[PDB]
């Protein structure tokens, strides 16, 4: 939206079955954000977990 707050990520989860495309990140607030690497755009936070 228009409200942006930077929250430190305390956990990073990467798996071969998941592959390089999906990266799992856990924020300081407690929510989990998934970042998908794209050739077309540098980074996309495709899914927000337990918002």
């Amino acid at each position: 939206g228009e409200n942006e707050e930077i929250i430190g990520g305390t956990a990073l989860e990467y798996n071969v079955e998941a592959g390089p495309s999906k990266f799992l990140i856990g924020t300081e607030s407690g929510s989990i954000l998934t970042a998908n690497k794209k050739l077309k755009k540098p980074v996309e936070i495709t899914t927000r977990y337990g918002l």
């Binding site: 707050e5 929250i7 300081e28 607030s29």
Partner: protein
Amino acid sequence: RLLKEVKYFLLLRTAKDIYTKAETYRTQIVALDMIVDNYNHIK
């Protein structure tokens, strides 16, 4: 600790001019540090 302390408070929900020259103080210290290292080696 005080600077890192303030950021955590934001996450959990006339001093501006001083905080504004916080950015200037950091640049000056890095520049001052380089000459000090150079000035001590010769000494």
